[PDB]
């Protein structure tokens, strides 16, 4: 299945049961490498029969949350707080979306919901969702709207001076205050620019493995690893191995950095 | 006696009189190990014949306060600020609580007082109080209520994939924005998950000894030690020795982290 | 041309194509060294056919933003939000100011813009500007007005206790919350006071090279480099090579550090 | 099977096939943590069909070698240089030792061959051997001699001030310049003395897991891991889990340190 | 030309002429990264019209030297001291080797001279040689002999557990106490085994670029770079970019490590 | 009792019985701080009924050995290997020495023994001696001779630029390659010279407490502590408390540093 | 007064008289910066009324010594051991050299003495000498001769790709296994090559001031400072201020580094 290793990591939590205290996770001043055996699942408030693990919250200094959601048999989502926009990405399984016709989202499907937009995600079997939420930044008479889609149905964008394959999930229109990029590196390929920008990131490695650099820290990574990149931290990546690398990325945009 | 070493640490301050500047205490970006020889006791404003030593305050980035109150003869407590909730746990001594009847609190006894709830703690001989205070986060029309009890009465809670015995002092209801856990470990037992969560902690080791890991730091701990765990700091623990480990722990709950 | 080595640094990005992930940039808690291989250019909103890269933003804990704007053939600028004073400085090219008259702004020609002071920049061929923005701290009734000039036209001010050549593009009258200094160093010359002050800095080395100190970190620098100095961060410089050193410097002034 | 995890580690090399460059191994000035995914097996000189991995050699600053020997079907050992004493301990399999009769060795069986003592190890199927060799420090006329045994047959020794169960495979008389110990720790138990001695070590954890402290470094460990301890390195261990800990240890003795 | 970048590194020393003191070179306790801007060339004693730069000498704790020799018009080699075996490798130009016979050596050509083997390297126009010298370690009554060849004529050896392409320039027989390896990696390929071995290394990256891990340090590397690996330093490499990586590697062999 | 705190230190091993893995001991590149909880006692070879604890040996790079010998009932010294010179100092108890009119030495007594000078130390009750030993560096004809004495019956020497009070147990004459110093410091006094010399030290604090500086490390110290100072390590000491600091110091002298 | 500050540093020990333990001295693994407050002066053996302080000895990993001899009222210089070569530099004062005729060495005068060569220095008043002593390495049948002279009498030398003015005090002739250079930099100039080589230095900053880079370390240096440079340490210098930088330097040459 697609994204299988993102749910079944080559180095899983159980392979460490005889290494007391060991972990690959790190939380530093400007970034964080959050790995599978550190995930903290607990009932998701307001949700019905769902465990979740918060990987990133503004406690870190971000303006967004990023959490994993384990939905099981007959379990439903619950409305997010007032003025909070939400974005979900099916990483495994299938869930149904409803408010104009019930759309069924399987793997690789995603859905954006404008702040205060009444909806419900219901599941009847399994489903592992990767969700992003943020207190929307109203700007002028500008507003967002319901977006539903599939990665593959998104066109390959131009990447001046880069070789990775880029696909954006939400519209690039000024309304949206963040977008979800899908980036792919073939084995050996890497980022030419050593980005240093006020933007901030939260990412999930869906396929492959490689080396990710943050500040003066170099980290080996595998499918399933999660990373938080705080504004202005030097970032870089290289894809390694026989298979390609794909990571889901959150990026804030269309707003004055003041 | 119950919690005797918590009040009489094996390695005491006087023991260090011949080691200028020496301390086991460490205050870092996302945590802190606060030890006895560093406690700063000063009279608690609005209290009677009660010496207090604050160990954690929002100055650290937390949203709660943690302090020890050494109540001597004919001592009494003072009401907390407006909208501030309070919780006291008796480590040593006896103290009566009034408001609906009148409860006598001894070692292992505790009491949660809702925000703006009138009450008074009065000590005849002496009492040692470990208390947490916080600005209550009102969630709709929910409100808390007086809670009284003692650890030895709270049922053992099972936690999946873990081996430590757990007890929760307060109700798990949505109205409470924090709970106090009691965690026990037999010598040799440890946390299977190396937690990284949005939740923040404040902890006190009542009995036992062991190794506490915070981020990339490892600290030997003995009863009486206090720890501050900021959000997302990697945390782990292992119980060592002949006797068991037991620690009181604050944990924020039921509120959207966004 | 003057400042040419800023637009074209000796050690330029392409010279690093065969050093995967290699970078001279550093982002620490109290300072930052942003180099050319890390600039992230994205289309500046409200501007016309122009790429821009933010180098400093409040996310760093500053009260100001500093960015590079690469104006191309037939381009114009956008107005900043409300109460955002703006200063621009031409490091290369030419661009006409407009709105009260119309100045042909070229290399070394800067233009201040009071808050909400409507104005516009337009370029027919090509221009590169280093612009600073920040929410003006309204002091009493005092207010600002348009200012336009050139680096070589400003006076050489005395520098008590120091040897570098000092200039200030903007007035010192308390109406201005920030000032932009010009500093010249002859090979072998260095700052005499290991400054430690509340003021914050953002700087671009316009000409030359030398060693820059920040806290306990020492960085070799060349023209085109950019530095971020947070308050209270120990700073120090020394110019080297056969040619003098010159850097554009932002500095906050005339406002209670309270 | 005895010591099954020592040869089939819970966190094995394969589990790390998707984490490029990752390793739990460390080599520092005064110690080393050598783990499986780092063993370098090469044909052993003078041996027949036997791959070997040197874990420790005098390049480290030690006076002994410690290597692993994978003896496959129909194999035999080779004689060691002149004046080199040898000790072999069987971790997996079986091998016959001939030369005073021939003995069939098995897991837990060990043989010590004095310097220049003709012998031959002949394996028919498989056998894993941990061996130590050293340029014997002759002392006067005393001379060591053939010693063939089995851990279990060895008696437990009194270790004043410690709770671990100790055994020594070789005699304690002056001729021997080193001894091999078998140290057992029950969960929760740990060393009381934070050892700092001139004696150097080489160890292999056969069963269990725990934390090993070396200087200011703390390492989680599991059966299979190997430690190099240089003279005078602060050392400490703690056993953890459900199962007990057992490590093989080399120790130089009976020779004036000056 | 073959190995061009190796002769003219992408990031050449001149490119850094405006960065006083800057360098990619590192010299640590158990390894080193020697780069072009650090090459110290000097008249090589006993040679004629040849500049030499020693990169590694036993002062590092190695048992061999490694240097680049810049032979100019009408130049000739100098004999190595008694018992000093020598191996040369041509990375640029051409030189002749006389005295048994005479071979014309171009790029990729090499010659191993046994200890005390009289010879001579005469170059007409110019050539660049990376040469290795070591005091030969006599074992019993074995002796090495002249070996001359070409990397390409050498056969691809089996690399069990790895995917890279391996070639060995000298015989693997007992007489040789070291061999020089040629290792090729296609982009995205890396070492599966994170080596920790007593063998020490001398390395020159002839083609490609990538990331090298030495202990807990990561280094971006390019053609022309040189690395020193002391015994037991954890090592790892991953090739990145469009073209493959190739590196010359010295390795000590066939001698007992005690 | 004299030097009582040296034998029974304020902070003692048993005070840390609940602090798993904790120690004040440090073993670095240029120095060491060996504290009581790290002392490793084992039967001293040839000695009778005595347990020794080597604190310093050549393995550290020193040219001497320093150890504490604890002699019990009917105990006696043993002879040091050939050509070795021995110095003893009784810190607790009583020992008699013979071989010419025997002698009895009590706390604060001592005796130097020329290389190969036959002698015997006979104790009844018990005594704890701190002893040094080295391979005497013969300076041609020069020879050493037996010595007996007591710190207090030894003259106070000059100490220009230094406020402390000194005493040298051995004669400064050329035939002696080392002496033992006694340095007293009064609360608040400290070494004015921030030493960096070829000499090497072994220092046991007998009285007082304070702060010793070694390189960039600052170590709080208490009577009983022991320090290893390698050549050229920046050293320093300041005394604190109500009492005075007093330590026994080894210093190599009278030999060419070549 | 030529070389005044070298004898009376701008930052003096007495200035640090109220900074307990402070020192600018650094002694690391591969290098060292020794400053004025750390010099340990003690009576030089075999000398007459001369206080000497050893700055660098083979204990550092050097093959030479470098000390300062303070010659007072009627003082003589003791003879070096057998086979030890010796060079002397008069930093200040006056001393007379006699074996073949008398020689009056004054500030800037130097004399090199071959091994086993007989000579004597005699001082009436004061004289500060910086001397280097080394066991001579006999190559073939070459022998060195006695050399005497002054810096400015020495010719300027070609400094390819460099700008500092060079001068050598000894013959580059093969017989000599070391030389002493005089290097001058103007304020602002610096080394282009960030040197990494087998040669080992021992320098004295005679005039000027600037920044010295050793490894990843940056040290502000002043006249009077001393530096030990072990083989292969990355090194670099920059002169600064109004006067010029001038430093004396040791460097081993003409010997195979095997
Ligand atoms: Mn980015
Ligand atoms: Mn927790
Ligand atoms: Mn400033
Ligand atoms: Mn031990
Ligand atoms: Mn290797
Ligand atoms: Mn000293
Ligand atoms: Mn040099």
Curated annotation (Swiss-Prot), chains A, B, C, D, E, F, G:
Residue spans making up a coiled coil are none
Reaction it catalyzes: (S)-2-ureidoglycine + H2O = (S)-ureidoglycolate + NH4(+)
Compartments, as annotated in UniProt? Endoplasmic reticulum
Q: Which parts of the sequence bind substrate? A: 195, 235, 247, 251
InterPro entries reported for this sequence: Cupin_2, RmlC-like_jellyroll, RmlC_Cupin_sf, UGHY, UGlyAH_cupin_C, UGlyAH_cupin_N
User: Might you give the EC number(s) for this enzyme?
Assistant: 3.5.3.26
UniProtKB keywords: Endoplasmic reticulum, Hydrolase, Manganese, Metal-binding, Purine metabolism, Signal
**Stated consequence of mutating residue 195 to Q:** No effect on manganese binding, but loss of activity
The enzyme's first-digit EC class, named in words, is hydrolase
Tell me which Pfam families the record gives: Cupin_2
Q: Where is the Cupin type-2 domain?
A: 182-248
The record's GO molecular-function terms, alphabetically, read: DNA-binding transcription factor activity; metal ion binding; ureidoglycine aminohydrolase activity
Task: Tell me the impact of changing residue 247 to A/F.
Answer: Loss of activity
Report residues binding Mn(2+). Answer: 195, 197, 201, 235
Q: What is the effect of changing residue 197 to A?
A: Loss of activity
What biological processes does GO assign it? allantoin catabolic process; purine nucleobase catabolic process; regulation of DNA-templated transcription; ureide catabolic process
Provide the effect of residue 235 to A. Answer: Loss of activity
Gene Ontology annotations for the cellular component aspect, listed alphabetically: cytosol; endoplasmic reticulum
Required co-factor(s) are:
Mn(2+)
Known partners and oligomeric status: Homooctamer.
Q: What does this protein do?
A: Involved in the catabolism of purine nucleotides. Can use (S)-2-ureidoglycine as substrate, but not allantoate. The sequential activity of AAH, UGLYAH and UAH allows a complete purine breakdown without the intermediate generation of urea.
Return the similarity comment: Belongs to the UGHY family.
Q: What is the recorded name of this protein?
A: (S)-ureidoglycine aminohydrolase
The record lists the organism as Arabidopsis thaliana
Its taxonomic placement starts with: Eukaryota, Viridiplantae, Streptophyta, Embryophyta, Tracheophyta
């Amino acid at each position: 299945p697609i994204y299988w290793k993102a749910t079944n990591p080559t180095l899983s939590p159980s392979h460490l049961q005889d290494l007391p205290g060991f972990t690959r996770s790190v939380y530093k001043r400007d970034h964080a490498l959050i790995t599978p055996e550190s995930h903290v699942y607990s009932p998701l408030p307001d949700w019905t029969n769902t465990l979740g693990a918060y990987l990133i919250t503004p406690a870190t200094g971000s303006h967004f949350v990023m959490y994993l959601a384990k939905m099981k048999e007959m379990s439903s989502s619950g409305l997010p707080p007032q003025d909070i926009e939400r974005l979900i990405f099916v990483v495994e399984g299938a869930v149904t979306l409803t408010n104009s016709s019930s759309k069924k989202l399987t793997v690789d499907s995603y859905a954006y919901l404008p702040p205060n937009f009444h909806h419900s995600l219901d599941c009847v079997e399994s489903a592992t969702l990767v969700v992003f939420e943020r207190r929307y930044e109203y700007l002028g008479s500008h507003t967002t709207e319901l977006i539903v889609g599939s990665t593959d149905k998104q066109p390959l964008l131009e990447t001046p001076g880069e070789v990775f394959e880029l696909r954006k999930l939400l519209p690039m229109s000024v309304a949206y205050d963040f977008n979800i990029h899908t980036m792919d590196f073939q084995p050996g390929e890497f980022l030419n620019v050593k980005e240093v920008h006020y933007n901030q990131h939260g990412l999930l490695l869906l396929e492959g493995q490689g080396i990710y650099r943050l500040g003066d820290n170099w980290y080996p990574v595998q499918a399933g690893d999660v990373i938080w990149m705080a504004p202005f931290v030097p970032q870089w990546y290289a894809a390694l191995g026989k298979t390609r690398s794909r990571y889901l990325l959150y990026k804030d945009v269309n707003r004055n950095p003041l």
